[PDB]
Amino acid sequence: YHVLFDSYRDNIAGKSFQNRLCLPMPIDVVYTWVNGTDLELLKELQQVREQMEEEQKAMREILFEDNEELRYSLRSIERHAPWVRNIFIVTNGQIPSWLNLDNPRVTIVTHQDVFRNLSHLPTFSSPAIESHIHRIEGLSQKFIYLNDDVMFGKDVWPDDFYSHSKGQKVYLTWPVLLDEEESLKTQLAYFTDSKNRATFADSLRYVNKILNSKFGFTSRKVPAHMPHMIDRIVMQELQDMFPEEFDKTSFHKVRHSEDMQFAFSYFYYLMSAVQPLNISQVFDEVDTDQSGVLSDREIRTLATRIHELPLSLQDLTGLEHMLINCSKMLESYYDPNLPPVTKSLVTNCKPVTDKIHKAYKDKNKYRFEIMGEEEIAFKMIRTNVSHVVGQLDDIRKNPRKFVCLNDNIDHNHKDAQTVKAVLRDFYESMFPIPSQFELPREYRNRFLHMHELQEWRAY
Amino acid sequence: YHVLFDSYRDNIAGKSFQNRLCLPMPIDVVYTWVNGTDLELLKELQQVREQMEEEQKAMREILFEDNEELRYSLRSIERHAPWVRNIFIVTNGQIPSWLNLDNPRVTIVTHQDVFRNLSHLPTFSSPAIESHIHRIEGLSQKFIYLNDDVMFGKDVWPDDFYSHSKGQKVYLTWPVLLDEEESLKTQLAYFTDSKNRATFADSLRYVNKILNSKFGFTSRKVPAHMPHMIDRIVMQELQDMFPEEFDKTSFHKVRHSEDMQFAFSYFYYLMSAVQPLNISQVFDEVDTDQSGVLSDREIRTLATRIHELPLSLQDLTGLEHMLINCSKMLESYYDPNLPPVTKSLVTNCKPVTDKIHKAYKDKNKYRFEIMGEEEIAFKMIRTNVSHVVGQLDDIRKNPRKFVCLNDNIDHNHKDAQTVKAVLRDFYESMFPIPSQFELPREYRNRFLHMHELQEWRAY
Ligand SMILES: *[C@@H]1O[C@H](CO)[C@@H](O[C@@H]2O[C@H](CO)[C@@H](O)[C@H](O)[C@H]2NC(C)=O)[C@H](O)[C@H]1NC(C)=O
Ligand SMILES: *[C@@H]1O[C@H](CO)[C@@H](O[C@@H]2O[C@H](CO)[C@@H](O)[C@H](O)[C@H]2NC(C)=O)[C@H](O)[C@H]1NC(C)=O
Ligand SMILES: *[C@@H]1O[C@H](CO)[C@@H](O[C@@H]2O[C@H](CO)[C@@H](O)[C@H](O)[C@H]2NC(C)=O)[C@H](O)[C@H]1NC(C)=O
Ligand SMILES: *[C@@H]1O[C@H](CO)[C@@H](O[C@@H]2O[C@H](CO)[C@@H](O)[C@H](O)[C@H]2NC(C)=O)[C@H](O)[C@H]1NC(C)=O
Ligand SMILES: *[C@@H]1O[C@H](CO)[C@@H](O)[C@H](O)[C@H]1NC(C)=O
Ligand SMILES: *[C@@H]1O[C@H](CO)[C@@H](O)[C@H](O)[C@H]1NC(C)=O
Ligand SMILES: *[C@@H]1O[C@H](CO)[C@@H](O)[C@H](O)[C@H]1NC(C)=O
Ligand SMILES: *[C@@H]1O[C@H](CO)[C@@H](O)[C@H](O)[C@H]1NC(C)=O
Ligand SMILES: *[C@@H]1O[C@H](CO)[C@@H](O)[C@H](O)[C@H]1NC(C)=O
Ligand SMILES: *[C@@H]1O[C@H](CO)[C@@H](O)[C@H](O)[C@H]1NC(C)=O
C-alpha cells in the first residue's frame, strides 16, 4: 500500500533507506546435481581411455547409488529458508525424474549456457562447473551455492550469510619431462570415489601459493563445506583478476591438483582485496562544510589524522608550511600568508599526499566477518552402523543450521543397505513433507522400514 | 509502487517477511534536558530547606553554565542518524530557546504527562524522569534514550542497537534510628555537581543486590554511558515486575543511594529474564508432520533430545514403557501395545514432563548481544587545557560512533573559559551545519575565536 511506501520516508531526513535496512534481495539458490546413468559411465570410460593413451604417448616421448539428497535438500530449502526467489540446478543434460519442471521457480541450466567455450562442455569435473555459475542468465547479484548434499535447519535467514554492517560472513575450519611422471601418478587416483561429483589438498596448496605470490604471505584456513553466498560482481572481478589461471581449471576434464576452488579462492580474495586510496574521499570526509575550503579546524584534524599523537605545534606549523609551499610552486586563517586550502591544493602537493598515504594505509575493498564451526554440521558416514546412528542422534539432539553428510559408503559390505536405510530414515524424519518442486509421486513406494528395525533388534 | 510491494512475496513460499528482514521501525529519540534558570535554583534552595528541616526533625526525634550540548547532539542526530522518526525532549516546564517548535518532528513533553502520580512532578532528580519515558504518548515500541550529552558519529545505523538474530545489543564496561544518620550524611553531598541533571555507585550496588536476591548471584558489569535502545514492552514488564521498588525511585525528590537506574536495571533484566518451558512448543517442533501424532522417528528424536548421548536402546524402551503407562492410567509402531502418541499423552505423563524439564532447562526470554568499549568515546574534561586538547585530538584522529564528554568544569579557574572555547570549537568542527530543529538565529554572534588561538600561542 502507499502508506507502507511512505512510511520509510517518515524520518527526519525524509529520504529512503531501503538499500541499507531491508537486506539485499532477491537471493537465489544454485544446485550442482549429477546422476550415474549408463551414458555417463560410458563417457567416463572413453575419457579414461583417452587419458590413458595420452599418458602412453607421454612416456613414449620419454622413451553410483544416490540416496536422493537433492529431494531432501529442496525440502529443507522450502522449510527453513522460504525467502529464496529462484532455484537453479546445473547438469550436463540430465533432468531429475521427480522434479516438477512445471514450477517456474525451479529451472535446469545446461552446461551449454554455463560454459562459454563450447569445447569444454564434456568436462566431468566439479571445479569446472563451479567456476561458471555467476554467468547464469537471470541470476541475482547475491546467491547461495548448494553442493547437493548440504541441508538447512533452525530456520536459516540471510542474516547468517551477509550483513550490511560487517559485510559477508566467512566460515572457516582447520588451517591449510618429470611432469609427465606426475601426470602418470594422477591417472591412478581418477576413480577414488569423487567422480560421483560435487586431489583436493594439493589444489588448496596451489591456490594458497597463488594468493601468497600475489597477496603476500599469510596463514590461511580453509572454508567449511556449507552453503556459500557468492557475489556475482566480486566473482567476476576475480575472473578477470586471473584470466589464464581460471582457464586451466575449465580446460581440465579431470579435477587436477592444479586448479582453484569455489570457496577458498572467492573468500580469500574477498578478505584480501585492496582498494587504492582516494584522496578526494579523504578531503570530502574531513571537509564537514562541503564548501571545498578547509578552515583551521579542518587543517587541525588533518594534522591529527596524518601525524601521530600527541600533536605538537611543530607538526601543524610544518603542515602549513608544506601547504604554502605548493601554492607558490603552482574565515580567516591564523597564518596571514596561508592561501585558501581547496581540494586541488591538497591533492597536488606531493609530500602531503605521501604523508596521507603513510597514515591512510591500504584498506580492504570488501568487508567480511569470521566465525567458527559452532553452527556447521559435518559428519562422517563410513560403513559403521553404530557410528552412523550415534552421529545422527547427535544431529537430532542439537540441530544446526548447516548440515552436511558425506555419502562415501563402501557399497560392498554386509552393513551398507542398513546404513542407507538409516540415512533415509533420518532424512525423512527431518523433512517428511514433500516439497513443491516434487512431481506427484512416491505412491505406495514403501521403502524398507525393517532394516532400521533390524538394527534396533541387533542393538 | 505495487511492484515493490509484490517483490517481497516473490520467494518460494509466497508469503511476506517484512517483520524479519526490514528491521524494527519506527525508532524514536528521547532527550532529557534541563536549564539553570532562576526559578529552578529557587525551587532547589527551598527543597534544600525542606530536606534540612526534615533532617532536623529527624535528629530531634533521635534526641549553571551549559555549552549547548543539545544543539550539537541534535545536529549529530540529523547528520549521522537520519533514520529517526520523532525526537522527544522531557523538561519540567522549560522550552529550549533555539529549538524550532514549528517542526512537527520535535516535541516537548512536560513532566505532567511523563509522571502518573501528579504529586511527584517537582522531583528534580534524573532517575525519576528516567523511570517514566516509556509512558509517553505517541512513542514507538523501540526507541533510543539520549542523555543530552552523548553524540553520534561514523553514520550510526539501527544495526548497532538491535539485531533480529542476536536480539538487542548490550554494551558493558568495568565490573561493578541509625538510618537517620545515613540520611544526615546524604544532605552534605546534595550539591556535588550532579544537580545539573542527566550517590551513583551505591545505587548500582542496590540494584545488584535486588537482582541478586531475585535472579541469583552473578558477576555483573555496568552499561556504558551511551545512547541506549529501550523496548517499551520490556520496560513495562520490568515496571510491573517491581511495583513498589520503582515507587521509591519516583518518590524521592533527591537522587538517593537506594534507587534503580535506566540502563543497568533494564539491560540485566533483559539478560536474565526467564521464560517458563512450553511443552506444546516442544511437541510442535519435534512433530515435523504437524499431524499431532508422533511416529518412531519422532519418538527416537525425543529420546535423543531428552536423554544424554550415546543413546542405548534401554533409554528408548524405558521411554516407550513410560508412554504406555500413562495411557492405561488415563504408521505402525515397533511395539504392538504402544498407543498413539498425541500431544495430550505426552503433556499429561508427569515423569516424561519432568525429564523434558530436566533436558529443556530454563531459557532466556529475550535475546541479547555483548560487546566491549571499542566503539564508545567516554573522555574526561577536567580544567586541564593540555589534557582537553589531547583528548579532543584523539577523538578527531579516530572517530567513534558514540561520543560522550562530561562537562564537569571547575568553573572557578584561570583555565575555564579557554576550555569552554576549545570544547565549542570541537563541537562546531564536528557539526557545523545548523540542524532543522534550530530556529533561525546565531546571526553575527561571533563566539570567542581568540581563546583557542590564545592556547595555540601559549603552546
Ligand atoms: C538416474 O539414472 C538412472 C539410471 O542410472 C535413471 O533411472 C532410469 O529411469 C528409466 C525411466 O526413464 C527406467 O526405465 C530405468 O530402469 C531407470 N534405471 C534404473 C537403474 O533404475 C534416471 O536417469 C535417473 N534416476 C533417478 C531416480 O534419478
Ligand atoms: C563403530 O563405532 C563404535 C562407536 O560408536 C565403535 O565402538 C567402539 O569400540 C571400541 C573397541 O571396539 C571401544 O574402545 C569404544 O569405546 C567403542 N565406542 C564407544 C562410543 O563406546 C565400534 O568399534 C565401531 N565399529 C567398527 C567396525 O569400527
Ligand atoms: C536558560 O536559562 C536562562 C537563564 O538562566 C534563560 O536565558 C534568559 O533568556 C531571557 C529571554 O527570555 C533573557 O532576558 C535573559 O537575560 C536570559 N538569561 C541569561 C542568564 O542570559 C533561558 O531560560 C535559557 N537560556 C538558554 C540559552 O537556554
Ligand atoms: C595536563 O595534562 C598534561 C598531559 O597532557 C600533563 O602533562 C604531564 O606532566 C607530567 C609532569 O608535569 C609529565 O610527567 C607527563 O609526561 C605529562 N604528560 C605528557 C603527555 O607528556 C599536565 O601536567 C597536566 N596539567 C595539570 C595541571 O595537571
Ligand atoms: C577456447 O576458444 C578459443 C577460441 O574462442 C580456442 O582457440 C581455444 O582453443 C579454446 N580452448 C580450448 C579448446 O581449450
Ligand atoms: C573516488 O575517486 C573518484 C575519482 O578518483 C571520484 O570520482 C569519487 O567521487 C571518489 N569517491 C569519493 C569521493 O567518495
Ligand atoms: C618548503 O617548506 C619548508 C618548511 O617545511 C621551508 O623550509 C622551505 O623553504 C619551503 N620551500 C621553499 C622552496 O621555500
Ligand atoms: C500516589 O497516589 C496515591 C493515590 O493515587 C496517593 O495515595 C499516594 O500518597 C501518592 N504517592 C505519593 C504522594 O508519594
Ligand atoms: C505456548 O503455550 C501456550 C499455552 O500454554 C500456547 O497457546 C502456545 O501456542 C505455545 N507456543 C507455541 C506452541 O509455540
Ligand atoms: C511403568 O513402567 C515401568 C517400566 O519403566 C513398569 O515396570 C511399570 O510396571 C509401569 N507401571 C505400571 C503400573 O504398570
User: If you count them, how many residues does chain B have?
Assistant: 459
User: If DSSP codes are grouped into helix, strand and coil, which group holds residue B30?
Assistant: strand
Cβ(A119) to ligand 5 under 6 A? yes
Lookup: cell for A315: 607538526
For residues B431 and B79, the answer to whether their CB atoms sit within 8 Å is yes
DSSP string, A324-354: HHHHHH----SSTTPPPB-HHHHHH-HHHHH
Cβ(B384) to ligand 4 under 6 A? yes
For residues A102 and A43, the answer to whether their CB atoms sit within 8 Å is no
User: If DSSP codes are grouped into helix, strand and coil, which group holds residue A229?
Assistant: strand
Residue B317: closest CA among B295, B335, B342: B335
Distances (CA, A) of B219 to B41, B199, B213, B285: 40, 21, 13, 34
Contact residues, chain A, for B301 at CB < 8 Å: 396, 429
Lookup: cell for A267: 573468500
For residues A152 and A76, the answer to whether their CB atoms sit within 8 Å is yes
CA B371 – CA B267 distance, rounded (Å): 13
Lookup: cell for A373: 564451526
Strand spans (E) along A244-375: 274-275, 363-364, 368-371
> CB–CB of B77 and A12 under 8 A?
yes
Kind of pairing between the strands at B142-146 and B228-231 = antiparallel
Decide if A458 touches B, using CB distance below 8 A.
no
Nearest CA to ligand 7 atom 14: A325
Question: Counting ligands in written order, which one lies closest to the CA of residue A413?
Answer: 2
Distance from CA of A313 to the nearest CA of B (A): 7
For residues B190 and B52, the answer to whether their CB atoms sit within 8 Å is no
Window A:40-99, CB contacts with B under 8 Å:
77-78, 82-85, 87
CA A355 – CA A42 distance, rounded (Å): 65
Q: If you compute the radius of gyration of chain B from its CA atoms, what whole number of angstroms results?
A: 29
Tell me the residue type at B30: V
- As a CATH number, domain B23-274+365-371 is 3.90.550
Strand spans (E) along B176-251: 221-223, 228-231
Give backbone dihedrals phi and psi of A122, rounded to 5 degrees, phi first: -80, 65
CA A406 – CA A390 distance, rounded (Å): 15
- For A426, the closest chain B residue by CA position comes to B297
For residues B319 and B303, the answer to whether their CB atoms sit within 8 Å is yes
CA A84 – CA A190 distance, rounded (Å): 36
Helix (H) or strand (E) holding A376: strand A376-380
Q: How far apart are the first and last CA of chain A?
A: 61
CA B28 – CA B145 distance, rounded (Å): 9
Window A:295-354, CB contacts with B under 8 Å:
297-298, 300-301, 304-305, 309-311, 313, 334
CA A149 – CA A147 distance, rounded (Å): 5
Strand spans (E) along B167-206: 167-175
Residues whose CB is less than 8 angstroms from the CB of residue B193 and which lie 6 or more positions away in sequence, other chains included: B408
Cell 557468492, residue?
A230
Sequence-separated contacts (24+) of A203-206 with Cβ below 8 Å: A203/A127, A203/A255, A203/A256, A203/A257, A203/A258, A203/A259, A203/A260, A203/A261, A204/A176, A204/A261, A204/A264, A205/A176, A206/A257, A206/A258, A206/A259, A206/A260
User: If DSSP codes are grouped into helix, strand and coil, which group holds residue A106?
Assistant: strand
Q: B216-225 burial, b for 16+ CB within 10 Å, e for fewer?
A: eeeebbbbbb
Cβ(B281) to ligand 9 under 6 A? yes
For residues B148 and B67, the answer to whether their CB atoms sit within 8 Å is no
A375 is in an annotated binding site: no
Vertex A380: Cα angle to A377 and A381 (nearest 5): 120
Q: B47-64 burial, b for 16+ CB within 10 Å, e for fewer?
A: beeebeeebeebeeeeee
Q: What share of chain A is helix, strand, coil (3-state, %, to 5)?
A: 45, 15, 40
Determine the residue among A12, A83, A87, A338 to mutate to test chain B binding: the one whose Cβ has the most chain B Cβ atoms within 10 Å: A12
Lookup: cell for B109: 513533553
Contact residues, chain A, for B165 at CB < 8 Å: 157, 159-160
Query: How many Cβ pairs closer than 8 A exist between chain A and B?
Result: 153
Distances (CA, A) of A58 to A123, A175, A252: 21, 36, 17
Lookup: cell for A271: 578478505
User: If DSSP codes are grouped into helix, strand and coil, which group holds residue A151?
Assistant: strand
CA A134 – CA A157 distance, rounded (Å): 22
Q: Which residues line ligand 1 (CB under 6 A)?
A: A 35-37, 96-97
Tell me the residue type at A307: H
Residue B296: closest CA among A290, A47, A456: A456
Q: Could you give the strand order of the β-sheet that contains B106-110, starting from the edge strand earlier in sequence? A: B106-110, B87-91, B27-32, B142-146, B228-231
Cell 507502507, residue?
A4
Q: What are the residue ranges spanned by the domains of chain B? A: 23-274+365-371, 279-361, 376-458
Q: Can you list the alpha helix ranges (DSSP code H) found in A105-172?
A: 111-114, 126-130
Could you tell me which residues are beta bridge partners of residue B150?
B404
Lookup: cell for A184: 602418470
> CB–CB of B396 and A456 under 8 A?
no
Decide if A444 touches B, using CB distance below 8 A.
no
B326 CA from centroid of ligand 10 (Å): 9
CA B343 – CA B111 distance, rounded (Å): 52
Burial of A128 from C-beta contacts in 10 A (0-12 / 13-18 / 19+): buried
**Ligand 9 atom showing the smallest separation from residue B283 Cα:** 13
Kind of pairing between the strands at B221-223 and B167-175 = antiparallel
For residues B448 and B421, the answer to whether their CB atoms sit within 8 Å is yes
Question: Counting ligands in written order, which one lies closest to the CA of residue A391?
Answer: 2
Distances (CA, A) of B378 to A285, A373, B18, B386: 23, 35, 36, 17
Lookup: cell for A299: 587543517
CA B19 – CA B280 distance, rounded (Å): 24
DSSP string, B114-152: H-SSTTSSS---HHHHHTTSTT-TT--SEEEEE-SSEEE
Residue B224: closest CA among B381, B401, B368, B377: B377
User: If DSSP codes are grouped into helix, strand and coil, which group holds residue B38?
Assistant: helix
For residues B399 and B426, the answer to whether their CB atoms sit within 8 Å is no
DSSP designation for B438: B
For residues A434 and A75, the answer to whether their CB atoms sit within 8 Å is yes
Could you tell me which residues are beta bridge partners of residue B228?
B145
Q: A185-212 burial, b for 16+ CB within 10 Å, e for fewer?
A: ebeeebeeeebbbbeeeebbebbbeebe
CA quadruple B350, B351, B353, B357: dihedral, nearest 10: 130
Q: How far apart are the first and last CA of chain B?
A: 61
CA B167 – CA B165 distance, rounded (Å): 6
Distances (CA, A) of A316 to A308, A459, B315, B384, B450: 12, 81, 77, 21, 18
Distance from CA of A245 to the nearest CA of B (A): 37
B289 is in an annotated binding site: yes
For residues A256 and A186, the answer to whether their CB atoms sit within 8 Å is yes
A393 is in an annotated binding site: no
Lookup: cell for B69: 550540548
Distances (CA, A) of A260 to A131, A173, A205, A207: 9, 18, 9, 6
User: If DSSP codes are grouped into helix, strand and coil, which group holds residue A174?
Assistant: strand
Q: Which of A15, A304, A396 lies at the smallest CB-CB distance from B301?
A: A396
Lookup: cell for B440: 533561525
Lookup: cell for A446: 514403501
Helix (H) or strand (E) holding A150: strand A150-152
Strand spans (E) along A248-362: 274-275
Tell me the residue type at A129: I
- As a CATH number, domain A22-275+365-371 is 3.90.550
CA A279 – CA A298 distance, rounded (Å): 15
Lookup: cell for A174: 582447520
Cβ(A281) to ligand 6 under 6 A? yes
Cβ(B19) to ligand 8 under 6 A? no
Helix (H) or strand (E) holding B368: strand B368-371
Lookup: cell for B259: 534507587
CA A350 – CA A329 distance, rounded (Å): 12
Distances (CA, A) of B446 to A424, A453, B78, B425, B450: 80, 89, 24, 12, 11
Cell 601418478, residue?
A185
Distance from CA of B390 to the nearest CA of A (A): 7
**Which of left, alpha, beta for A68 (phi over 0: left; psi -120 to 50: alpha)?**
left
For residues B229 and B168, the answer to whether their CB atoms sit within 8 Å is yes
Kind of pairing between the strands at B142-146 and B27-32 = parallel
Tell me the residue type at A297: R
Resolution value in angstroms = 3.3
Lookup: cell for B91: 523538561
CB atoms within 10 A of CB A458: 11
CA B93 – CA B109 distance, rounded (Å): 9
Residue A160: closest CA among A227, A72, A222, A251: A227
CA B185 – CA B109 distance, rounded (Å): 34
A28 CA from centroid of ligand 1 (Å): 29
Decide if A371 touches B, using CB distance below 8 A.
no
CA B235 – CA B116 distance, rounded (Å): 16
Give backbone dihedrals phi and psi of A354, rounded to 5 degrees, phi first: -65, -45
> CB–CB of B22 and A22 under 8 A?
yes
Nearest CA to ligand 5 atom 10: A117
Could you tell me which residues are beta bridge partners of residue A151?
A403
Distance from CA of B435 to the nearest CA of A (A): 10
Contact residues, chain A, for B142 at CB < 8 Å: none
CA A220 – CA A229 distance, rounded (Å): 20
Give backbone dihedrals phi and psi of A151, rounded to 5 degrees, phi first: -115, 170
CA A291 – CA A284 distance, rounded (Å): 9
B298 is in an annotated binding site: yes
Tell me the residue type at B255: R
DSSP designation for A158: G
Residue A430: closest CA among A49, A185, A75, A19: A75
Give the CATH fold of the B279-361 domain.
Recoverin; domain 1 (1.10.238)
Cell 567456476, residue?
A131
Cβ(B275) to ligand 9 under 6 A? no
- For B386, the closest chain A residue by CA position comes to A310
Burial of A233 from C-beta contacts in 10 A (0-12 / 13-18 / 19+): exposed
Q: A363-381 burial, b for 16+ CB within 10 Å, e for fewer?
A: eeebebeeeeeebbbbeeb
Q: B291-322 burial, b for 16+ CB within 10 Å, e for fewer?
A: eeebbbbbbbbbbbbbbeeebeeebbeebbee
Could you tell me which residues are beta bridge partners of residue B87?
B29, B106
A381 CA from centroid of ligand 1 (Å): 25
Nearest CA to ligand 5 atom 2: A117
Nearest CA to ligand 8 atom 10: B117
Q: If you compute the radius of gyration of chain A from its CA atoms, what whole number of angstroms results?
A: 29
Strand spans (E) along B180-247: 221-223, 228-231
CA B119 – CA A214 distance, rounded (Å): 73
Burial of B397 from C-beta contacts in 10 A (0-12 / 13-18 / 19+): middle
Residue B231: closest CA among B368, B77, B408, B351: B368
Sequence-separated contacts (24+) of B107-110 with Cβ below 8 Å: B107/B138, B109/B136
**What's the count of helices (H) and strands (E) in chain B, helices before strands?**
19, 14
> CB–CB of A17 and B83 under 8 A?
yes
CB atoms within 10 A of CB A404: 18
